[PDB]
Every structure is written in C-alpha cells, then in structure tokens.
Design a protein around this ligand. Sequence first.
Ligand code: ACH
Ligand code: ACH
Ligand code: ACH
Ligand code: ACH
Lengths: 537, 535
Amino acid sequence: EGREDPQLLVRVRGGQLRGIRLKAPGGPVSAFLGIPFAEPPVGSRRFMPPEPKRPWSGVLDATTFQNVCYQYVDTLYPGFEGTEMWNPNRELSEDCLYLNVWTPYPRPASPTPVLIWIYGGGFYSGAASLDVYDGRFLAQVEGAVLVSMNYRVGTFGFLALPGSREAPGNVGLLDQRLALQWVQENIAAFGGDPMSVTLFGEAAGAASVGMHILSLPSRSLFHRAVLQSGTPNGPWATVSAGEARRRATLLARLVGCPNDTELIACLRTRPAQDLVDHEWHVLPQESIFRFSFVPVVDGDFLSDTPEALINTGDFQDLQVLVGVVKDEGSYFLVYGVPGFSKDNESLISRAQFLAGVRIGVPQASDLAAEAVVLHYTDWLHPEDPTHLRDAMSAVVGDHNVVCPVAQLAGRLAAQGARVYAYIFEHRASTLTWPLWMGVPHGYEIEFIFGLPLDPSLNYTTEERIFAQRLMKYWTNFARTGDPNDPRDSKSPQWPPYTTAAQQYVSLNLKPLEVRRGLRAQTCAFWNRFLPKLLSAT
Amino acid sequence: EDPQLLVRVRGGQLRGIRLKAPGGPVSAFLGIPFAEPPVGSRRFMPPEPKRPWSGVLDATTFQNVCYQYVDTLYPGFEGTEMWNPNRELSEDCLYLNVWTPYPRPASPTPVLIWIYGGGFYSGAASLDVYDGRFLAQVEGAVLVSMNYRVGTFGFLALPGSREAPGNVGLLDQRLALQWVQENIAAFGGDPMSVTLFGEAAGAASVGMHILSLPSRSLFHRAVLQSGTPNGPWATVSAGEARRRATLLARLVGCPGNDTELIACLRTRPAQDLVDHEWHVLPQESIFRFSFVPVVDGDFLSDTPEALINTGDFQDLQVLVGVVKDEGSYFLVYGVPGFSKDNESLISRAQFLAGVRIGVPQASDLAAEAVVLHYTDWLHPEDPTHLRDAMSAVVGDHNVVCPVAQLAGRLAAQGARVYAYIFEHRASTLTWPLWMGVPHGYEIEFIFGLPLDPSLNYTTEERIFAQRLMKYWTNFARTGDPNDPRDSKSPQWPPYTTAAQQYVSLNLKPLEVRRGLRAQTCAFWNRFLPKLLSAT
Ligand SMILES: CC(=O)OCC[N+](C)(C)C
Ligand SMILES: CC(=O)OCC[N+](C)(C)C
Ligand SMILES: CC(=O)OCC[N+](C)(C)C
Ligand SMILES: CC(=O)OCC[N+](C)(C)C
C-alpha cells in the first residue's frame, strides 16, 4: 500500500481486504466483492456443513464478484433476456462461498443499519452477483450497508440422507447462517451496525428468511425480516425427512451409486455436472413450482414442520414486512403446462385447464383437483379461453405464494408480530415477457434495489420516482421496524396487518391505497378446506 | 235465477255466485266435486271420478280443507295464520273452484290452473291469497284451483302394495286436470290452452306433471314458483317411504304384511295420524316433510334427476323463479337463535349447528365445506353476516340451486324457459325486516290482491301487481310473458344455458341479469354430489 485509495483498505477477522470505488448516479460507493466466509466446500466437504474460512496472509483483492455456486442453467428460451437475467453471470464452481458488501463512500462515521439480501431460485439456482441485486443504489441514496452472500443450491446445498453425519441436509441454510455470523463479527469494520440487521429475500430467499426466523440459532443474528413472494410454509419450500431420503437415494442410483457412508462417499466421487444433469429426474410427479432438493424437516435446523412452528411460535419481538406481486403464477406456466408459451397469447381450452391443474397442484387427489377446477371456473363463461388462461395462472400463484403468505401474515400477527403486507402491481415498462403474464414473480426486485435510478436502463421518470419511494419504505423498515416516513404525514399511511382488519397496501405508480383481506375467500379454500379434504378423504 | 250462474257439466248442473271485483262482477263456482270422497276404505287409495248427481248442485261456497296439521308456532299471528286452514278440516275434501269473467267469455279463453304449496303436508285452494277474482276480472282469465290430499292421506306409501301405492295426492291433481279437459269449455275455458302454475310444493307438483306421461296431454305450459321436482325435499325413494309408513304405523299401534298394516291404519281417526306425522323424519331438520311424492317407478318412472337429465322437452314453455330470501321463513321453525320477535343475530357456534339442521343429509366434511363457502372471511364472526348466510344456505340448497339446475336442463333439452327473481317486499308484511322477501310472499301480487283498496297496499304495489298479472297471463296466452303490443319494457329474454339471462321483478322496470347464483350453485349442483359419491 501507500499509493492506493486509503478508503478501500479494511481489515476483517480473516485478514486485510482491498475494495473498489463504484459509480452510482448520485455519487461514489464502496464495494467489497468476493470476500470468502467459509472453507471451499469441495472434495470431502461436499454435502457437509460449512467450516468458517481460515485467515489469509496479505491483502485479499475484493474488487470482483466470485464464482457462482454450481447449478442448473436455464435453456428454455436461449438468448431471451427475460430468462437470461437470472442465469449465472460468473464461472460455475463448487468453490463459491463468498459474500459482498456495499457501503457509502466515504464509509459512514456512525453505526449504520445493515440490510442482508438472500436470493431466490427454487434452492437450485441464483447468485448474489446478478445485476438486479446490485447494492450500489441503496448504499448511495439511502446510506445503507448492504450485504449479500452466495449459498449452495441443488444437490450441493440440499441433498440429504437425514440422520447421517456426511449429508445431514440443510447445508445451504447453514452457508447462509455462517454469513450472518460473519456480519456480526465484521460489519462494524465497514461502519455497519451489528445490532440493526434486517434480512430480506425473494421467493426461495424469502422462504430462507422465514426459516431463519423459525430456527433458534439464527434468531440472535438479526432483528427484522422482509419476505418477498415466498414463505417457509407452503407446498414447495420444504420436504419430509422420508421424501428427502427417497430423492437422494434415487439420484444416487441414476448416477451409478448403488449404509449411508458408502452411498455418500460414492456421490462425492461424481463430477458436479453429473449431479446437475440428473437433478430433475427425482420429482414424484410431473409438476411446476416444485424443486428437487430443498430444506428438509430434520428435527435440528427445523425442529418441526414450518406449519407447526408458525402455529405455536411466540413472535412478540418480531417485525416483518411480507408481500406478493400481482401475477405470481404466470412465469411458471411456460415451464411445463401444455398450451402455454411466451411467444403467443396462450389462450387455452377447458381440457388444457384440467390438465394444467394436475401439474400445478401435483399432490392433489382427483377430488381435490376437481374442487380447484370448480372454484376457479367462471360459471358464466366456463369455456372462455382468456378466463381459463388467467385462472390457470391464479391457481399456481395462489397455491404456492399468495395463500402461503396470507397464512403466514395471519399466524404471525395472531401471535405478537408487527406485520406489514403489500401487493406490488406495477409492470416494468422494460419487461420482455408478454403482456398476458402481467406482473410476474421476481419483477419487483428491480425497483426495491433502485435500478430505475440508472438513466442508462431506459425506465420512465415515474418509475424512477416510484423506485425511490420503495427504497424509502424498505430502508425505513430496516431502520425502525416501520416503513412509514416519520416526518411526512397525510401522504398515506401503511397500517399494520391484523387478524381483525386484514389491512395491506397497493404498491404502484399511484399513492398508497389501503385494501382489506388478502384474497380472503380463495385462501380459505387453500388453507382451511383443502387440508381437511386430505386428512379425511 | 241468473242464467250466467248456471252451468251443465258432465255430472249434472251447478249454480255459481256473482262475486264483486274492484273493476266489476265475476262468476265463481266454488266447491265442485271432482272425485268420490276418499273416505273409509278409500283412504290412501287413488281417487275415483265423482258419480253424477241430480238437480242443481250448490257451488256458491268453498268446500272443506283436506285434513292436515295446523300451525301453532305463533298463535294468532297473521304471518303464519294466513296459510292455516280457513274452512273445516275433513278427509272429504276433493273439490275444485272455477272463476270466469261475468258475462261468460264469448270465445274459448286460456285457462290457468293453480296448485297450492304447503310442503305436501298442508294448504287449501280457499286461502285469501289464492283468490281468482282479480285475474278473472282484469285479464279475462278462466282460473281453476283444486284441493288435493296432503300428509299421510295424500302421500303415505307402501310401494308395490295395491292398497297404499303412493302419490295419490298427485293423482288427485291429475283427476282435477282431467275434469278441466272434460268440463271447462262449458265455462268458456279453452281446454287446448291450459297453463299449470303453483308455488313451493305446488311448483314441485307442476314439475312432476311435466315428468309424468299420462299428465302431459292435460296441459300445454307450466309455471314453477319457488319449487322444483328435483332437489332434496320434493321426493323420497321407495325404501325411505316404506320405512316412514312402517314407523308411523308402529307409533299408532299397527299392527308385517302390507294389507294388514294398511287395514289397521284405515281404522284410525284422522287426528291420530297427524299426531305422529312429525315423528318419522330421519334427522333433526328444517325444510323437510314426512310424507311427499315417492319414486315408485310408476307416476315417476325414475328419479326427478334422472328424468330431467334424459327428457325431451322440445314442445314445452316454462316460467320459473325464486324470491330473494327463500330460506328466512324456515329458520324460526327449528334453528336455535332465530325468532320473528328479534333481529336474530347469531354466533358462529350457532351458525355451524344451524348448518347441520339446514343440510340434514350432509356428512361432517360436507357441512364444513358449506360453512367455509358461506363464511365471509373478512367478517367471519359478524352476527349480521352469520344470520344472512344461514338464510342463504337454506334458500340455495332447497330452492335457488334446484331451480337453476331445472332451468338449465330444460333449456338444453329443447324447452322454452323464462326465469325471474322476485325482490319486492310487501309493505303490509307482518314478518320482521331481517327475513326480507320470504318464501311465499310473491303469490299475493300475482293473484292481484293489491287491487283491492280495502287491503291497504300502496299505489306503487297496485301498478306492480298489474304488471305481474300481465306477465303471467301473457305467458298463459302465448308461452311468452312479453306484452305483444307494448314496444319494450325492456324485453324479458328467454333463459339459455349459454347466456343464463333472467329478470328482476320489483318496483323498478325489468332489469336483465346473467347467471342465477352461478358460482354458489356450482358448489351445490356439481361439487357436493361428487363429495357424496367418493364419501
Ligand atoms: C423455472 C423453473 O421452476 O424450472 C424448473 C424446471 N426446470 C429446472 C427443469 C427448468
Ligand atoms: C422461477 C425460478 O426458479 O427462478 C427465477 C428467478 N427468480 C425466482 C429469482 C425470479
Ligand atoms: C313450517 C314447516 O315447514 O315445518 C313443518 C313441520 N312442523 C311445523 C310440524 C315443525
Ligand atoms: C310453512 C310452509 O311450508 O308453508 C307456508 C305456506 N306456503 C308454502 C304456501 C308459502
């Protein structure tokens, strides 16, 4: 050193770091990218819990994103931005346990509230390095310290032989928890306040956040929580120990691995790509919005099912912001429901709808699927292909996201939590998906992170202002447990969600509007009636 | 001797009576026998045609009311008593009534035949609300109404027996219908233009005549108000009628072997039979009736469901409808928490318990499905919502969805169907406001009672009754309730399975709506049965 920018040199527990001055529209920010927080989970360490990173000598370069965790790469629409923006943007490697930090430049002189991002992608994909997760805007405009981590996905993250030592399951969640521990020890070196840490995440990232809420060793590592379009409860976020065993064993067979020790040892000899090549061959039914390797109810990380834990938990101390986008299901329809495509209007027949329901509600008996169809049919125009297309989307959206979230918000509020709920209804003007998909899963993230503030991205002026409002809600919540601006009143208030009033807000170009009841009639169908059909048949 | 009031029918001569309607005279012939009294050994038996008589039969007065249960829930209260017998009870009750214009119509006039309701356990053609005076005077209609046997007398069946074969009260109706074919021309009626109409059990009866072949050559058009042959209450199986008859017999000390059991039942005074009429139902219930038409494989060759699903209805015109609050009336007759004397604000607990009684045949799982569907999840515990939903459950299950199913099957199988919902609450109604527009309270408007100034209806209601009398009689004339001279009201379109159009009848002009409680009736008509099947 001696000739470098003295504001980019920072020491952490493992040693010295050098970061990079980045440009944001309104001025510079500090970034520290690819900081290792675990020993590379390679070789004999595959499937194993992470071990904390051993200290390095000299100055670690933290100026570039590190490798993305080994994962399936989407091939449905090759060249198409709508899917490619979610694809890995760095080399795939099992050596991938790194985190990123953005802070004001120069670094804040007083302890600053910290936001920790956890990406989604079904627990089989994702990366903290994608463009839509760029922390520079929140850092620059809000003065926030933003942290994001890679965590293992797919088999590498979630393959489990429950009860074994060598593959106990949930290790991707343990990667996440280790990064939270890293923030506790080190974030003050960056001017971050370890006593004000807010988790946020979308989809599987949101289920992750919820699992940290429900897991006692994680509880002391953060203070507030944001869950966007995902929950730890519901039909996809977890599996039974028995089902996890069954999927691990089948995958083992499919790659030529015929006592748990022997089987796991043989899996550890397999090239990473082989595991990925076979990970979609283990699902019990033809399905969408189901993922092969996900958190498992081990009776350890998750001491009971997420359902049981939200029903009996004490959440007096907790503050949560939860919400959904207007069209949660539409995205998933093109990945497996015959009749659906990005390249046409996807008008479908009644027959194609009944077939779609079986794929979208894969665990449903015949009677249960008939209930779904009868509920979502418009009996005034039962054959209308536009209505049938839109109902198919709502089925998948309600079943996997909207009603799981409605449930969570009710259970948390009944048991002491301060809960704020939203529905995000603005379709980005630069969206490349067709109009029929409305406001698809994942397409609020862009706005929360402040991308429209970059003039080179071609968003409208209104979108720029709208993004600034949302960043303000998110960071006000991180800061105080309350998204409302303390100073400004009469400009509409966001009231807490309660069981008695069921209030939530619309997020769009218009000022906040307060609505009551989150899909209340339909979610009574999913959350109260459908289960009772099962546990009686 | 007024020559207008003197008629020769096939069985001899009759003398009627000049009655006064607000607009002028009408001729009435009340208490005309159409069958041999069904007494002694004829109890439970099909009716026999009335033997000829000498001289002039006096037909100036209503005859006895068929022997039936008399309501005692609210003694002296007009809202219940208006349906109670207004003449003496007697098993000797097979008589009918004819109103015609005065003077007698110069050319053959369309004929309307009224069939009363009363759950198949009660009713009479002599009630004030069934007065044919107004329709005769204003519309020039020939109006006919009969007594038919109710309760055990009309519907106690031991299926396959010769002495108590079931459905005799429907056969009573059929005989009155045959009498109209043979005799109505002498009164100026057109036997080639006969429209049946009826309400509740009367509408179910009209529907049973639609579904029974020997009845079909006896009328040309049909109106079913608030009732259907299909649904949960209008019929029972042979097995279930046998059981109820066998149980009642046991309760009155009779006696194994049909002949013997039926002979012993015939020795029993009428009131002994009625005394135990309400001790044979399988469940604690409301909107259920002990003795009703039976699926005998004869009058009804298969179930009403089977017959409407497979029938050919191409030559048929039908008018069907419901009132806005079909179920409210019934709740005070057995659902804890409900009374006419207060607002009936109930708890959630009272709502779940109320559902088991309103849907008595429902399994635990089906009951929950109903509760979950009718709960408003924004206001799950609000007493006003819970009360109104209880009413709605009972109305939909028993009348609205049964009607929606019938309307749909008829339209699809070639019938011409017009549907309505009746939404005006009579200003003179003695029932409380929370009951809204209850089961049975459209009848007085269609019969035209608001036209009697002594009765204290509003001017609005008089104009409104005139509109309804016109739709009903237009329908009788042509099979289309639209006025063929008026150039738009707007027009009442036919009900079809595609468009599902029906009209609201109230003080405002006709409004066309689409879909008769479509989402909720899918639940009852499509989902609940599938829940029955698999469980
Ligand atoms: C988008 C999505 O959920 O993909 C799952 C199906 N897959 C991985 C085989 C394409
Ligand atoms: C649907 C899926 O599996 O991945 C898309 C990326 N996501 C969920 C973060 C928007
Ligand atoms: C009013 C009604 O339909 O109930 C009949 C049975 N009752 C009155 C004997 C209890
Ligand atoms: C209590 C009962 O079932 O009958 C009421 C009279 N009715 C049905 C003609 C309106």
